[PDB]
Structure formats: structure tokens, C-alpha cells
Design a protein around this ligand. Structure first.
Ligand SMILES: O=C(O)C[C@@H]1CCC[C@H]1C(=O)c1ccccc1O
Ligand SMILES: O=C(O)C[C@@H]1CCC[C@H]1C(=O)c1ccccc1O
Lengths: 227, 226
């Protein structure tokens, strides 16, 4: 096996996709073999495709999906409104395990927040993390209410003994304000902040995105993610 | 003693205050004596005053708070930026306990979400709720994301044997919408949905507001609170 990180977030819209693509780029630039995995993908009828956005921004070719649903809602809802069923737990776990390899960083991108149902019955990304023995990267906002939403998320990880790989601020303004700058300070007292991605990172072209991604993370923390 | 409810939320700006006023008004129209405690208030510099809005909208007169901060931040940030510690855990717990009396419904309003810091050292609404043996009422949006934020809040409540008295949707859009409708159906599967307040209800004058509030709740449940 290798290193499996689930990428979840304090919510929806926090920047899960751009953070996967950013970690994946910085990891590749570390010479790490990177796979990215999106077990459950909704909103396809709106053009939502996180794996394609990660392939686009980060040049990851090793991409692996499973469930796709048209409506941009929670997977459970999006499935019912298409006459479709959620994946099974072991359908998700098998998909992760088949990508897992020694020396590979495999990134497992959730849908919405940590406690969203991804599989029947009530199976969360947290349960997937326990099974595949993965730690969790938590993508957060810089905005108002992020401390509560983060505290909740981290607490939920610890209740199931799922280690916290770090926090990533998935969109960071410049110049930052008084509330944002106070949040970033407090977030470092709750957990390690592995990065803060400049807003509109998803607009950068291949090179710029990589140059930013190499800049955003500590090279030592990235390099140390994989034996 | 009587009955102490903490009214919390999944986030900031989800309708905590209007749900306070709404259940106070309903319980008053049940002939219950209502007090509302808001230990810490922020955002004053721009005019925030939740106790006032509860008085305006529900006519509650027992309205109790300890500190007020200018900056519209989380309490501890406001305290650091103003240069002044939060109240102590003792003052909060004793105030709520002095407000509590038989035949009274005492609502306690947090600030932000369940786990924002309210008092020194690092004590939250959840702690306060344990110390005063209070159930918790959770105010939730109906937006994309509410189920997750709600499950997390519930799990945090159970994690400390703080009973959940139920959910209220703080703002119900018009027209509802596929996601809000979907979210309201699945909210009721994880917890009892005590009320859904129409959007815009906080601008109501006091007369309409109390009518909305009589309709918004189950009269048998409200009356059974005390
Ligand atoms: O990954 C994202 O958060 C962005 C997607 C894009 C459209 C809906 C989002 C979604 O997945 C989601 C949102 C709320 C609750 C559960 C969910 O699964
Ligand atoms: O209580 C509310 O949510 C409304 C207030 C009004 C002004 C800032 C809000 C606030 O207090 C707050 C905001 C972010 C985090 C924790 C907080 O306590």
C-alpha cells in the first residue's frame, strides 16, 4: 500500500477540488506518483466534473470515478431524482484499494462535507477513511463561521479515530481583512494549516497553477506524505 | 427549577435570534413566563442587539446579558481586538441559574455555532448547556449543506450527553425550491422539525409576528415544555 488521504471540507463550496489539484501538483513536483479518486460525483447535468477539473489544472492522468448523478444536490437526493441507487460501501472501498500502491499518494475527494451519505446505508467519507485507514485533509474557508464548522469537522474525525492530515484554506483573499486574518490565526491553534490557496486559483493556466501549487505547500510536509 | 433551553445554530446567520423570539412569543401565548439570556453579544458597533429584537418581536421583558463587543466577529476575536477578556464560565452559569424558576422557560442564546468560545477558558455553549442541565435546540438553514452541518452539530451534542430538543429551520424560502424541499424532508429523518419560519419574518411588526409564531409551532409541544 501507499498513502491515502481523503480530502473533505467544512462544507460545500470550500474548494475541495482545487485543493486536490493543488496537492496533486505539488506532490508530482516532489516526484511523487499521484492518483486522484472521486467516488461520488453529482451535478453532472450542470457540467460539474471534479476529476476533469483536476486533470485540467494539475495534469493528473490517473483519475478514477464511479458514481455520476445529474442534479447538483446531495448524492442521496441526486440519486433518487434519477431513479438511481448509491454505490455500495465495498464498491467505493474496492475503487480506492485498486489504486493504492507503494510510493503512491492517492487522493480521495469527498462530496460536500464529511458526514454526507456517499453509499448505502448512511456510509460517509469518514467510514471510508476508517476502512482504507486513510487520514483526512480538511478544506476550510477563511470566512465567518469557519471556526465552528472546522471544530465540528475535526471533532467528528476524532470520534472515529481518523487522523487529521491538516487544514487547507481553499480560497484566501489578498489583501486580507480583519476577520479573515483573525480566523487564519485561530485555525493554527486548532490544527496545522498546510496551505492557503489564492482566490481564483482555478483560473490559473497549467504553469501558473503548478508554480502556485509548489509555492502553497511546505515541500517537507508534502515530501513526507509518502514513503 | 423550571425549564432551560439553549438555542444554538449550525452556523452564523441561520436565524438563531428570530427562532428565539418566535418560540418565546409562542410560549408567552401559551401563558408561559419566558426569559431570554444572551450572555455575549457582538456586532454592536453596527447595531446588533439580539435581546432587543426578542423584546420587540415577542415582548419578553426578562432580557439578560453580560458583555457586548463592537466588532461583528466571534466573541474571542472581538475580545482580543477590543482588549478585554470574555466573561467567566461562572458568571454565565449563575446568571442562567438565577433566571431559572418554576413555571419559566429560560432560553439561552449562544453566539455563532455550538462550539464558538463563549467564556474563559475556552468554554462553549455546549459546556454551558451541560453545567445547567439544559437541552439544546438547533437552528438550521434549508440550503445545500444543511444536513452535514446538522449531523455534525447533533454528533457534537450527543458527544457530551446534551439532549437535542429538536430542529427549527430559521428561514423557509418562497417559493421553497427543489433543494430546500429535499432538505426539509431529510432533516425530519435525523431529528424532529419543531418549526419552519417563513423568510422575512424578522421584519414583521409584533402583532403579525406573534400570529406567525402561534402558527409556526406545535401548541402541544410548546405547552409541554414547562
Ligand atoms: O463537492 C462539492 O461540494 C460540490 C458539489 C457540486 C454541487 C453540489 C456539491 C456537492 O457535492 C454537495 C453539496 C451539498 C451536500 C452534499 C453534496 O454532495
Ligand atoms: O451570533 C451570530 O451568529 C450573529 C453575529 C452577528 C455579528 C457576528 C455574528 C457572530 O456572533 C459570530 C460570527 C462568526 C463566528 C462566531 C460568531 O459568534
Amino acid at each position: 500500500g501507499g498513502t491515502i488521504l481523503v480530502v473533505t471540507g467544512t462544507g460545500t463550496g470550500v474548494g475541495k477540488t482545487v485543493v486536490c489539484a493543488a496537492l496533486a501538483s505539488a506532490a508530482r513536483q516532489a516526484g511523487i506518483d499521484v492518483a486522484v479518486c472521486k467516488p461520488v460525483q453529482t451535478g453532472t447535468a450542470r457540467g460539474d466534473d471534479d476529476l476533469a477539473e483536476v486533470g485540467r489544472l494539475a495534469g493528473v492522468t490517473q483519475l478514477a470515478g464511479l458514481a455520476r448523478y445529474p442534479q447538483p444536490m446531495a448524492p442521496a437526493a441526486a440519486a433518487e431524482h434519477a431513479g438511481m441507487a448509491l454505490p455500495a460501501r465495498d464498491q467505493i472501498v474496492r475503487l480506492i484499494a485498486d489504486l493504492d500502491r507503494p510510493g503512491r499518494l492517492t487522493l480521495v475527494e469527498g462530496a460536500g462535507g464529511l458526514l454526507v451519505e456517499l453509499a448505502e446505508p448512511g456510509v460517509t467519507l469518514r467510514d471510508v477513511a476508517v476502512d482504507v485507514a486513510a487520514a483526512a485533509l480538511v478544506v476550510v474557508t477563511a470566512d465567518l463561521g469557519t471556526l465552528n464548522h472546522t471544530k465540528l469537522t475535526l471533532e467528528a474525525l476524532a470520534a472515529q479515530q481518523v487522523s487529521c492530515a491538516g487544514l487547507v484554506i481553499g480560497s484566501w483573499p489578498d489583501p486580507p481583512g480583519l476577520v479573515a486574518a483573525s480566523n487564519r490565526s485561530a485555525l493554527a491553534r486548532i490544527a496545522m494549516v498546510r496551505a492557503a490557496l489564492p482566490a481564483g486559483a482555478a483560473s490559473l493556466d497549467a504553469g501558473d497553477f503548478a508554480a502556485m501549487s509548489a509555492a502553497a505547500f511546505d515541500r517537507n510536509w508534502v515530501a513526507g506524505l509518502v514513503g
